[PDB]
């Protein structure tokens, strides 16, 4: 035994499955419209983004 | 952007997996069309007694390409355009541990052959890969192996001048990005820069006193008054009278020609800018800007 | 119904199909050539529908964005959008981090004098309360300025596009090529008037197609200590003139530098400056003066970014 | 140090100061917070069990 004790500290994870309750009509959402924007034209394929 | 290299004889089982590793790699190619043979790709026209400047000037006059697929009956390439986004794998031998957001360069190979070339015997032509190193390392890898090639010529004639214990301490150890790299050395590539940097080494002290004493007038540029007090005292005692005037012209028509052809080979631009890199997948997206 | 609306949007942004004229049949060659010439003649007249068809031919190359990840105390939340970005990559960190230096944050590392920079000295102090949080992360702010190796570590990146600032980690997106689209407007590069020094001003040179912006990083001494000074230039005079014009700008610095080097000579002390090539502004697109809170900031337009290696000048 | 209704707003929304990584061998410090779902209640109470 050297002349000193010590304290040890860890961290430990847990996969927890949760329960979310959320009451009626609290948030109010605003949904836009999908707008397609072409960006890339290659010789092989043409990509898009919505 | 596709180039097919036909192979009239099928590959061996040893030569197949040697190229399965180097599946993404930058290769020079003497013409930019697709119907080309196995004798076209690589530096086999100039490397297979190689000389440095003939390969460095060849890369800027070339059209590089990227392997994408290694099949048994043939090979497949991809022509690399000016300022073109790609995805290049770090596969080059020896390994240098590229960093993201760097400026990769393309150098001629100067290390041993088993890292440089892959020996093919299915068709009898050995292909040569270039040296793809970051720009700040590839110029520190060569401002020492050109120093090492000098002292391996001094100690070959006068062996008492060069200490081998201190020559192989500094010249073969390069530290970049906090990592020391020990480089493998047994140099017949750099036997022309050593004969250009030394044939230019003597004409510079004779040349600056010839050119400071010619530009003396009322309309002198003011900074050259200050840059006079840097040249040493022994250079300011050179007798230019021991040569003739028609001999002194040829010590400028030769002198400046080793200040241009020696300068315009280090400012060559077959470089490419990596913008994303992962150190365990060894993949790198980039863009290639010639010159 | 809503899936059919997207079918009309994708099929209105497609590229035009290439004309397939069959050169093997008789009448099929005659009816395919006629639709080339009934269609070029309706792309030449000045009507609006002919101009409506003329812009679908889109040969546009694209910007290539880089996603960086900076500590939040080396990068202010109050940064103007369009600030130029550098990258300092001295070593390999234990974590995947990066150090991005704006030209108002590289003013605090340099310590160049406020007589040169009267307005970006008040700004660089009010954002950086001590200047220590920058200087603690570079342990060689004297040995990289003595030997002249600080410009070998910076890589130019491009203007800023998005800044998601948080408490400890700030996400910074740049635009390394092309014109950067915001994240939708086109972000032009913003420089202070304090740093940018024009060369095209004079008391008839050709109106070329293009004008370039350079970056000079210059080594010098202040308080008998190593420091530096970064300035920006703008001209389209070709590379041989501007290097000879930057030497005329730094005439007063070199003459006051080698008073001390006439005493003693180290070979670490000779290298002086380095000129980069940042990007190309198009011709006669004048920058618009803006103010921040009063900081005169020139914001350009259509600045596509390039990347030149640092070439020494002296 | 602030009022406790500002701490309840900060609890669920903003992630705290430098927690551990997930599915790595040596338990590094987390960054980039993309799909990072960490809930540490010892950083608020300042206690260890």
State the nearest Cα–Cα gap between C177 and chain B, in angstroms: 9
Name the DSSP letter for residue D49: -
CA nearest to C145, candidates C274, C313, C246, C276:
C274
Output the CA torsion C155→C159→C160→C161 (10° steps): -130
Please give the C-alpha separations between residue B251 and each of B63, B212, B213, B264, in angstroms, as whole numbers: 37, 15, 16, 20
264-283 in C: which are within 8 Å (CB) of B?
265, 270
Contacts of B152 (CB under 8 A, 6+ apart): B187
Q: Considering CB atoms only, which of D20, D27, D48 is closest to A9?
A: D48
**What is the C-alpha separation between B229 and C280, in angstroms, rounded?**
39
**CB-CB under 8 Å, A46 with C6:** no
Residue B165 φ/ψ, nearest 5 degrees: -75, -25
State the nearest Cα–Cα gap between A22 and chain D, in angstroms: 15
Tokens standing for A13? 């994870």
State the nearest Cα–Cα gap between C15 and chain A, in angstroms: 8
Tokens standing for C262? 């006439």
Q: What angle do CA B110, B115, B120 make, to 5 degrees?
A: 110
Please give the C-alpha separations between residue C232 and each of B175, C149, C276, in angstroms, as whole numbers: 32, 19, 10
- Chains in touch with D (≥3 Cβ pairs < 8 A): A, C
Contacts of D31 (CB under 8 A, 6+ apart): C69, C95, C96, C97, C169
Ramachandran bin of C83, using left for φ above 0, alpha for ψ from -120 to 50, beta for the remaining angles? beta
Q: Tell me the chain A residues in contact with residue C13 when contact means C-beta distances shorter than 8 Å.
A: 36-38, 48
- Contact at 8 Å (CB) between C105 and C74? yes
Q: Is B280 on the interface with C (CB under 8 A)?
A: no
**What is the C-alpha separation between C169 and C88, in angstroms, rounded?**
17
Q: Which of A13, A15, A17, A21 to mutate to test the interface with D (most CBs of D within 10 A)?
A: A13
- Contact at 8 Å (CB) between C120 and C298? no
**What is the C-alpha separation between C195 and B69, in angstroms, rounded?**
50
Q: Tell me the chain D residues in contact with residue C169 when contact means C-beta distances shorter than 8 Å.
A: 31-33
State the nearest Cα–Cα gap between D47 and chain C, in angstroms: 23
Reduced to 3 states (helix: H, G, I; strand: E, B; else coil), residue C197 is strand
- Contact at 8 Å (CB) between B92 and B111? no
**CB-CB under 8 Å, B85 with C307:** no
Q: Tell me the chain D residues in contact with residue A16 when contact means C-beta distances shorter than 8 Å.
A: 39
Ramachandran bin of C98, using left for φ above 0, alpha for ψ from -120 to 50, beta for the remaining angles? beta
* Burial of residue B114, with CB atoms counted within 10 A of its CB: 0-12 exposed, 13-18 middle, 19 or more buried: exposed
Reduced to 3 states (helix: H, G, I; strand: E, B; else coil), residue C290 is strand
**CB-CB under 8 Å, C262 with B101:** no
**What is the C-alpha separation between B82 and B289, in angstroms, rounded?**
5
Tokens standing for D24? 């790595």
Q: Tell me the chain C residues in contact with residue D29 when contact means C-beta distances shorter than 8 Å.
A: 95
Which residues lie across from C215 on neighbouring strands? C232, C276
Contacts of C12 (CB under 8 A, 6+ apart): none
Name the DSSP letter for residue C218: E
**CB-CB under 8 Å, C62 with A36:** no
Reduced to 3 states (helix: H, G, I; strand: E, B; else coil), residue B220 is coil
- Contact at 8 Å (CB) between C75 and C105? yes
CA nearest to C278, candidates C187, C156, C192:
C156
Q: Tell me the chain C residues in contact with residue B99 when contact means C-beta distances shorter than 8 Å.
A: 89, 92
Handedness of CA B279, B283, B284, B288 (dihedral sign): positive
Q: Tell me the chain A residues in contact with residue D22 when contact means C-beta distances shorter than 8 Å.
A: 13
**What is the C-alpha separation between A16 and B210, in angstroms, rounded?**
84
**CB-CB under 8 Å, C177 with B287:** yes
**CB-CB under 8 Å, C9 with A46:** no
- Chains in touch with B (≥3 Cβ pairs < 8 A): C
Q: Tell me the chain B residues in contact with residue C258 when contact means C-beta distances shorter than 8 Å.
A: 226-227, 229-230
CA nearest to C300, candidates C290, C285, C283:
C285
- Residue whose pair of structure tokens reads 């002249």 in the numeric block: C148
CA nearest to D20, candidates D30, D11, D12, D10:
D30
**CB-CB under 8 Å, A41 with C58:** yes
Q: Which of C5, C7, C9 to mutate to test the interface with A (most CBs of A within 10 A)?
A: C9
Cα within 13 Å of Cα(C197), Cβ side: 15
Please give the C-alpha separations between residue B181 and each of B95, B99, B120, B171, B177, in angstroms, as whole numbers: 10, 15, 30, 11, 10
- Nearest chain B residue to C91 by CA distance is B177
- Nearest chain C residue to D17 by CA distance is C168
Q: Which of C93, C98, C164, C168 to mutate to test the interface with D (most CBs of D within 10 A)?
A: C168
107-166 in C: which are within 8 Å (CB) of B?
152, 155, 157
**What is the C-alpha separation between B21 and A6, in angstroms, rounded?**
52
Reduced to 3 states (helix: H, G, I; strand: E, B; else coil), residue B106 is strand
Contacts of B162 (CB under 8 A, 6+ apart): B151, B154, B155
**What is the C-alpha separation between C255 and B228, in angstroms, rounded?**
12
Q: Tell me the chain A residues in contact with residue D27 when contact means C-beta distances shorter than 8 Å.
A: 11
Q: Is D13 on the interface with C (CB under 8 A)?
A: no
Ramachandran bin of B83, using left for φ above 0, alpha for ψ from -120 to 50, beta for the remaining angles? left
Tokens standing for D20? 């551990």
**What is the C-alpha separation between C15 and C70, in angstroms, rounded?**
39
Give the method used: cryo-EM
The number of beta carbons lying within 10 Å of the beta carbon of residue B279 is 13
Q: Which of D41, D47, D48 to mutate to test the interface with A (most CBs of A within 10 A)?
A: D48
- Nearest chain B residue to C97 by CA distance is B100
**What is the C-alpha separation between B1 and B227, in angstroms, rounded?**
53
CA nearest to C108, candidates C84, C89, C147, C136:
C136
Name the DSSP letter for residue B181: E
**What is the C-alpha separation between C164 and C285, in angstroms, rounded?**
30
The number of beta carbons lying within 10 Å of the beta carbon of residue C29 is 13
Segments of chain C assigned E as strands: 65-71, 84-88, 154-164, 169-175, 180-181, 186-187, 190-192, 196-198, 210-222, 225-235, 273-282, 288-290, 297-299, 304-305, 311-313
**What is the C-alpha separation between B101 and C172, in angstroms, rounded?**
14
* Burial of residue C181, with CB atoms counted within 10 A of its CB: 0-12 exposed, 13-18 middle, 19 or more buried: middle
Which helix H or strand E contains B169, and what residues bound it? helix B164-170
Reduced to 3 states (helix: H, G, I; strand: E, B; else coil), residue C194 is coil
């Amino acid at each position: 035994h050297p002349g000193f004790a010590m304290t040890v500290v860890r961290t430990d994870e847990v996969l927890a499955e949760h329960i979310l309750y959320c009451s009626r009509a609290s948030t109010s959402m605003f949904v836009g419209l999908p707008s397609v924007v072409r960006r890339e034209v290659r010789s092989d394929a043409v990509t898009f983004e919505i | 952007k596709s180039i097919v290299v036909n192979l009239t004889s099928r590959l061996f089982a040893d030569e197949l997996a040697a190229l399965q590793s180097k599946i993404g790699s930058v290769l020079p190619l003497g013409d930019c069309h697709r119907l080309q043979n196995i004798q076209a790709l690589g530096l086999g026209c100039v490397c297979s007694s190689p000389d440095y400047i003939q390969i460095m000037q060849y890369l800027s006059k070339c059209t590089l390409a990227v392997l994408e697929e290694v099949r048994p009956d043939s090979l497949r390439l991809t022509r690399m355009d000016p300022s073109d986004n790609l995805q290049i794998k770090n596969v080059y031998a020896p390994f240098f541990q590229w960093d993201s957001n760097t400026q990769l360069a393309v150098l001629p190979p100067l290390f041993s052959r088993k890292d440089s070339t892959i020996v093919l015997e299915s068709n009898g032509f050995d292909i040569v890969f270039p040296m793809v190193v970051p720009q700040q390392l590839g110029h520190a890898i060569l401002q020492q192996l050109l120093v090492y090639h000098i002292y391996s010529k001094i100690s070959a004639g006068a062996p008492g001048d060069v200490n081998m214990a201190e020559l192989d301490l500094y010249t073969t150890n390069v530290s970049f990005m906090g990592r020391t790299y020990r480089l493998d050395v047994d140099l017949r590539v750099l036997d022309d820069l050593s004969m250009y940097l030394c044939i230019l080494s003597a004409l510079v002290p004779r040349g600056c006193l010839r050119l400071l004493t010619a530009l003396v007038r009322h309309d002198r540029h003011p900074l050259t008054e200050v840059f006079e007090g840097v040249v040493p005292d022994e250079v300011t005692r050179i007798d230019l009278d021991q040569l003739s005037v028609p001999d002194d012209i040829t010590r400028m028509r030769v002198m400046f020609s080793y200040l241009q052809s020696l300068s315009s080979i280090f400012n060559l631009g077959p470089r490419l800018h990596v913008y994303a890199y992962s150190a365990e997948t060894l993949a790198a997206s980039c863009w290639y800007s010639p010159r | 119904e809503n899936a059919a609306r997207l079918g009309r949007q994708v099929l209105g942004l497609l590229p035009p199909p290439t004309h397939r004229v069959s050169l093997t049949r008789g009448p099929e060659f005659a009816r395919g050539v006629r639709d080339l010439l009934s269609k070029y003649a309706a792309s030449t007249r000045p009507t609006v529908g002919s101009l409506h068809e003329a812009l679908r031919q889109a040969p546009f190359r694209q910007p290539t964005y880089g996603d960086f990840l900076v500590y939040s105390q080396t990068f202010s939340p109050q940064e103007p959008l369009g600030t130029f970005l550098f990258s300092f990559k001295q070593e390999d960190n234990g974590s995947s981090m990066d150090m991005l230096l704006t030209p108002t944050s590289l003013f605090m590392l340099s310590g160049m004098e406020a007589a040169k920079a009267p307005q970006t000295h008040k700004v660089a102090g009010v954002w950086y309360g001590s200047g220590s949080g920058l200087a603690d992360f570079i342990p060689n702010l004297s040995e990289l300025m003595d030997t002249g190796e600080f410009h070998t570590l910076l890589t130019p990146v491009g203007p800023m596009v998005q800044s998601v600032h948080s408490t400890f980690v700030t996400k910074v997106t740049s635009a390394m090529k092309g014109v950067g689209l915001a994240r939708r407007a086109h972000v032009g590069l913003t420089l202070p008037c304090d740093m940018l020094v024009d060369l095209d001003e004079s008391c008839r040179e050709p109106a070329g197609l293009n004008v370039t912006i350079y970056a000079s990083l210059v080594y010098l001494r202040v308080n008998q200590r190593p420091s530096m000074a970064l300035t920006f230039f703008q001209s389209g005079k070709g590379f041989a003139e501007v290097v000879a014009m930057i030497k005329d700008h730094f005439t007063d610095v070199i003459r006051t530098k080698y008073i001390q080097l006439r005493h003693e000579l180290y070979i670490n002390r000779l290298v002086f400056g380095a000129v980069c090539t940042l990007g190309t502004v198009p011709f006669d697109s004048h920058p618009v003066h803006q103010s921040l809170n009063s900081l005169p900031v020139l914001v350009f337009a259509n600045f596509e970014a390039a990347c030149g290696p640092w070439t020494v000048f002296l | 140090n602030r009022g406790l209704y500002t701490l309840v707003n900060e609890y669920s929304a903003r992630l705290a100061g430098a927690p551990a990584t997930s599915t790595t061998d040596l338990q590094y410090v987390v960054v980039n917070g993309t799909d990072v779902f960490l809930d540490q209640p010892c950083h608020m109470l300042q206690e260890a069990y």
